[PDB]
């Protein structure tokens, strides 16, 4: 499965 | 896209080609950037219309790769080729199918 | 005998022509199993291997929702990195992301990874400890400071050595008949005269899995690496791979050259010498 949502932007 | 990489085109069959036995004609484009590219498979110089391709992915060095394929029965009369167009190319490059490569 | 799960993402801006193009692919080893294309009809994460099809509707809902969220961040990051690099809104740019994990033959965690690129060059990468980042330039260091303050590594690491490892274990079990195979290379050699005094020797490797392979030419035992043409490893389309390496030799001295093949499925490394009358 892909990583869960919620990573902050660059 | 400051870095631009020319596609390297390979034309080949899925299995060893035998005249009369159905096979798959492959065009593998790799090492190109940017990702915008046009690839067509040709039989005797005309575009084959029912041609599938892979989902775009890339290598360790970030350069993209795509596989275009279609089912075909090799003859010793018909000529097969791949036509690739990219920003790095002056004109659409045509690579003919050679059972030697 | 190690395995890997990897996810590849590509975001390509299309100025004046709507939203960026987003393509995501998931692979277990050299086998693709999932796909999301923003230009595809379904707008859902789709199965690309038979053993993943047995997953339920809630699995595909979660994959569709999370992979879409990746797309939203990549869309934002395209605008942000356009500022970082002081570039116009007229040009098209590219973001590429790869992440995943590796396990050994017993399922134990071996390594995690995440790498990002902008316009085909390195942007930022996670280190092997999964605690620190390596930016490629001073623009990327702005991102590094942001992710260090938000502690993105700690959250990502929990996925890379936890969730990723456990689901890789499940995929390997659900598709063991296809994923736990090692097809050794079918090898042969061809000969092509380019004149009456020179000829091309081509060393072939066909129908092997996984894709990692090494082809090396040797003259009298010594390598010929700078006179060797070696094409990219290519997929056959049936799940196996092909590669060849070529050398131009003087006619009548073909027996002085040997091709050496290395592959996971080979008992011993193969040595191929052209045969003459």
Residue numbers in the entry:
A (entry chain C): 1 to 10
B (entry chain B): 19 to 119
C (entry chain A): 1 to 277
Paper excerpt:
Mutation associated neoantigens (MANAs) are products of genetic alterations, making them highly specific therapeutic targets. MANAs are HLA-presented (pHLA) peptides derived from intracellular mutant proteins that are otherwise inaccessible to antibody-based therapeutics. The most common KRAS mutations occur at codon 12, where the wild-type glycine residue is mutated to a valine (G12V), cysteine (G12C) or aspartate (G12D) residue. We previously reported the discovery of a bispecific antibody, termed V2, which can specifically bind to the KRASG12V-HLA-A*03:01 neoantigen and drive T-cell-mediated killing of KRASG12V-containing cancer cells without non-specific activity against wild-type KRAS or other codon 12 mutations.
We determined the structure of the KRASWT 7–16 peptide bound to HLA-A*03:01, using X-ray crystallography to shed light on the specificity of the V2-Fab for KRASG12V. One pHLA monomer was in the asymmetric unit, with well-resolved electron density observed for the KRASWT peptide and the binding groove of HLA-A*03:01. The KRASWT peptide was anchored into the peptide binding groove between the α1 and α2 helices by the preferred canonical anchor residues for HLA-A*03:01–a small hydrophobic residue, Val8WT (position 2), and a positively charged residue, Lys16WT (position 10)—with an overall buried surface area by the peptide of 743 Å2. The majority of the amino acids making up the KRASWT peptide (V7VVGAGGVGK16) are small, hydrophobic residues, where the sidechains cannot make electrostatic or hydrogen bonding interactions. Therefore, most of the available hydrogen bonding interactions with the HLA-A*03:01 were with the backbone of the KRASWT peptide. In total, 10 hydrogen bonds and one electrostatic interaction were made between the KRASWT peptide and HLA-A*03:01. Specifically, the N-terminus Val7WT is anchored by three tyrosine residues of HLA-A*03:01: two on the α2 (Tyr159, Tyr171), and one on the β-sheet base (Tyr7). The site of the mutation, Gly12WT (position 6 in the peptide), was located in the center of the peptide, positioned outside of the HLA-A*03:01 binding groove. The carboxyl group of Lys16WT was secured by Tyr84 (α1) and Thr143 (α2), while the amino group was near Asp77 on α1. The side chain of Lys16WT, which is the only peptide side chain capable of making hydrogen bond interactions, formed an electrostatic interaction with Asp116 of the β-sheet base of HLA-A*03:01.
